[PDB]
Amino acid sequence: DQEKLFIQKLRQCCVLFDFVSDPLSDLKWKEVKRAALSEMVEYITHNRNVITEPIYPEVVHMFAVNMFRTLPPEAAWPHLQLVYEFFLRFLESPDFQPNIAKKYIDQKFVLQLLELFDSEDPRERDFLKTTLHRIYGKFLGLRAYIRKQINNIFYRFIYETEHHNGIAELLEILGSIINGFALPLKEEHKIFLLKVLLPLHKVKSLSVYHPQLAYCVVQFLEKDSTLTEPVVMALLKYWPKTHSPKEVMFLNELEEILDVIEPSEFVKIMEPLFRQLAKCVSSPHFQVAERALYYWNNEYIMSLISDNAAKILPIMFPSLYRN
Amino acid sequence: KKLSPIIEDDR
Numbered sequence: 563d564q565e566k567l568f569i570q571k572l573r574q575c576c577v578l579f580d581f582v583s584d585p586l587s588d589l590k591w592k593e594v595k596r597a598a599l600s601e602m603v604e605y606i607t608h609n610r611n612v613i614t615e616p617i618y619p620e621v622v623h624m625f626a627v628n629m630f631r632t633l634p635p636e637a638a639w640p641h642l643q644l645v646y647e648f649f650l651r652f653l654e655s656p657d658f659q660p661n662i663a664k665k666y667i668d669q670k671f672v673l674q675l676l677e678l679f680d681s682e683d684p685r686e687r688d689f690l691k692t693t694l695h696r697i698y699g700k701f702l703g704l705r706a707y708i709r710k711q712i713n714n715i716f717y718r719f720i721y722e723t724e725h726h727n728g729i730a731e732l733l734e735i736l737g738s739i740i741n742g743f744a745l746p747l748k749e750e751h752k753i754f755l756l757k758v759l760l761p762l763h764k765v766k767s768l769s770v771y772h773p774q775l776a777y778c779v780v781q782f783l784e785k786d787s788t789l790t791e792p793v794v795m796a797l798l799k800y801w802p803k804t805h806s807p808k809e810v811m812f813l814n815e816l817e818e819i820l821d822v823i824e825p826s827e828f829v830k831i832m833e834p835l836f837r838q839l840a841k842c843v844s845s846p847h848f849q850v851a852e853r854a855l856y857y858w859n860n861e862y863i864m865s866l867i868s869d870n871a872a873k874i875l876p877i878m879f880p881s882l883y884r885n
Numbered sequence: 886k887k888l889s890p891i892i893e894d895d896r
Contacts, residue, residue, distance in 0.1 A: 734887075739891050741891075
């Protein structure tokens with residue numbers, strides 16, 4: 563009975579309407595739909611044992627009909643926000659059984675969900691980020707396919723001309739994945755760190771997703787510290803050869819790497835690091851030099867410097883020291 | 886509110 567009304571209101575929200583010559587009836591309909599959604603958000607959030615098997619296709623269908631749309635070059639956000647909200651509470655519910663939902667949340671669904679990441683609305687990409695993070699976490703049989711399709715988006719962003727507004731949100735999800743990796747890093751993961759994450763520093767629009775990219779690179783080094791050398795050497799490779807404020811970005815990422823670096827791995831790249839660091843101190847741009855000089859306010863770096871002053875000091879101040 | 890870690894598994 564109450565299950566029947568749930569399905570009714572769900573299907574009721576599958577009706578897209580428009581009144582070209584009746585703005586008053588249009589507001590009534592949008593209010594009814596907004597109300598029904600809010601009622602269902604409150605319903606599945608604070609009630610237990612309400613998510614029965616027959617409603618699973620009803621929810622996924624309601625989400626698909628509303629969200630899987632053809633993106634413009636939104637305005638109806640009060641409705642879209644509720645749909646995202648409702649679907650999230652649905653996924654996060656303790657009554658949620660992925661073994662039943664895997665029938666309806668498949669690869670095509672995940673694929674269409676990723677299309678929406680190209681949205682220009684920061685609010686929407688945030689909901690999508692959370693939603694895809696839930697699906698990856700509760701659907702073990704989708705994890706492999708999701709990583710594959712995200713890897714494709716990056717490859718088309720770096721190499722191909724395909725720009726993407728959701729690069730940051732995707733990296734934020736990836737950081738959540740990397741942090742929970744197994745003990746020995748799979749070869750595909752190491753390749754991903756090197757063939758994908760590092761060339762992401764090459765793209766011109768780095769400013770948008772660099773904080774998220776830096777976190778991913780750091781998390782990779784927190785797992786396997788064997789990867790510290792090819793990462794650092796790559797950052798020095800992709801380093802802005804021309805003195806520009808973009809160096810501040812790299813200096814920030816480079817200090818965050820040094821915070822979690824192994825002393826034995828530090829010495830493997832301490833020379834080409836401080837050669838570049840010396841150039842930054844000598845930069846015509848004050849902001850770059852100011853940022854590089856801030857390295858000395860880091861206690862752990864000092865320990866690495868002091869215990870390696872025989873190799874570092876000649877590079878930083880060649881006027882005062884010799885090798 | 887940063888996303889909670891997702892522990893890698895086998896399936």
